[PDB]
């Protein structure tokens, strides 16, 4: 019953890899967003 290896393999980490990568995106795009905000703060100070 090799399929036991097939199914016990496929399920756990690959599906979790999807959610982990999906979570990684959710961190990243607001990570840059707050990098942008602190840059905008650095405009207003340096402008002054």
């Amino acid at each position: 019953d090799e399929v036991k290896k097939i199914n016990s393999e496929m399920v756990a980490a690959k599906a979790r890899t999807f959610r982990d990568q999906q979570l990684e995106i959710h961190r990243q795009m607001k990570e840059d967003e707050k990098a942008e905000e602190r840059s905008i703060a650095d405009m207003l100070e340096e402008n002054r």
């Binding site: 990098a35 602190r38 840059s39 650095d42 405009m43 340096e46 402008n47």
Partner: protein, 427 residues
């Protein structure tokens, strides 16, 4: 990790160093009183490179400041970060500069050098993992042009192994301020060629030109000019202070960018630069930085590389970024303009990545390069120095200090040989 001693000479050197220490203190997050007040643990990992420690929770830079007249030293101490410097480090005489190279070299130079040597040796032996010394001076006036070379000769004599990296303010060939300036630059070059391992040239014309081309500052002063110079100051040593994906110290740059011992004069460039209005519009990518770095307008040297050719180049990038993106940009920029690079040196470019970016900027990069366009800069002064030397008017001010005429003859012959050597490597 590897400590460096910083040396400043002249009115130009002290003010530039003052802004340089402001930038370093800001990036490490050191309070003006000398107490660390930062926000990240990475700042204290390797802060011993430029700072010492006192038994009061305080830090003191390894800075040695030299002048002939005490006016500049009091101005430096009066600054916002004046207290940060050790009181004894201020070494100064009670005589004016005189604007004469010979007067500073022989009369005042021999008097001051003995005391400065002891002060430097105190800082030199205060730490064991020693890298080479750093010098900032100007070649126009008397104190910087003469004393800086005399100290450089002593530094080479005592510590042959260490790297003597120097930064020089080349006399602005069309904007400079001193009548006898061609004499000072002519004489100082001879000492600088044989002693200094690394020489970087900065022209005030370029600083004003870059400021009005890119930054669009309404009322520029030396403070803004010193800040732009300080950016290259901090970017050069960045790999030493902070981690990176490919480390590169000064010795790495010297080995890669110097094909022959007398070819070490370099031109430096910085990116990104933006007017205080326009930065809403930029994308902050490696191609964006590459476009600014390789552009001739951003070069703080009054020479156009397109008139000459490259034979060595290097760039240091600061930030968390791709190795592959830097590899692609350098490969494309090398292949796209192949006419400007000599054939007998494949891969004329060098790369290095440091992980920690400067304050406020997610991406930053510094370009140090070499080209045969240096032949123009020294030709300008050589042609003028010939005009003075033909009529021999102002020589009497240099003879009165005991300087022989052969010093002029040997100096100009040295520059002429240097220009010829750069001419041969055109082919």
């Amino acid at each position: 990790v590897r400590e460096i001693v910083h040396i400043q000479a002249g009115q130009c050197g002290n003010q530039i160093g003052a802004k340089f220490w402001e930038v370093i203190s800001d990036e490490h997050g050191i309070d003006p009183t000398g107490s660390y007040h930062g926000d990240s643990d990475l700042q204290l990992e390797r802060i011993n490179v430029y700072y010492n420690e006192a038994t009061g929770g305080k830090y003191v830079p390894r800075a040695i400041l030299v002048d002939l007249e005490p006016g500049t030293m009091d101005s430096v101490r009066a600054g916002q970060f004046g207290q940060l410097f050790r009181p004894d480090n201020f070494v100064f005489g009670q005589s004016g500069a005189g604007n004469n190279w010979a007067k500073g070299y022989y009369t005042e130079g021999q008097e001051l050098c003995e005391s400065i040597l002891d002060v430097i040796r105190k800082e030199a032996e205060s730490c064991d993992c020693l890298q080479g010394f750093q010098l900032v001076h100007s070649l126009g006036g008397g104190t910087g042009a003469g004393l800086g070379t005399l100290l450089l000769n002593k530094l080479r004599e005592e510590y042959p192994d260490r790297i003597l990296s120097t930064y020089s303010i080349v006399p602005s060939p069309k904007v400079s301020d001193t009548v006898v300036e061609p004499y000072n630059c002519t004489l100082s070059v001879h000492q600088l060629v044989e002693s200094a391992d690394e020489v970087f040239c900065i022209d005030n014309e370029a600083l004003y030109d870059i400021c009005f081309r890119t930054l669009k500052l309404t009322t520029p002063t030396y403070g803004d000019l010193n800040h732009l110079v300080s950016m290259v100051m901090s970017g050069t040593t960045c790999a030493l202070r902070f981690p990176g994906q490919l480390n590169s110290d000064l010795r790495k740059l010297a080995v890669n960018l110097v094909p022959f011992p007398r070819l070490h004069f370099f031109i430096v460039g910085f990116a990104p630069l933006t007017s205080r209005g326009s930065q809403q519009y930029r994308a902050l990518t490696v191609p964006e930085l590459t476009s600014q770095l390789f552009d001739n307008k951003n070069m703080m040297a009054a020479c156009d590389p397109r008139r000459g050719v490259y034979l060595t180049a290097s760039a240091h990038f600061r930030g968390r970024m791709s190795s592959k993106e830097v590899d692609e940009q350098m490969l494309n920029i090398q292949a796209r303009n192949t006419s400007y690079f000599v054939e007998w040196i494949p891969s004329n470019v060098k790369s290095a990545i440091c992980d920690i970016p400067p304050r406020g900027l997610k991406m930053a990069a510094t370009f140090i390069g070499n080209t045969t366009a240096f032949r123009e800069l020294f030709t300008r002064v050589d042609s003028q120095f010939q005009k003075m030397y033909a009529r021999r008017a102002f020589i009497h001010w240099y003879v009165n200090e005991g300087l022989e005429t052969v010093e002029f003859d040997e100096a100009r012959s040295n520059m002429t040989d240097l220009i010829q050597e750069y001419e041969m490597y055109e082919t």
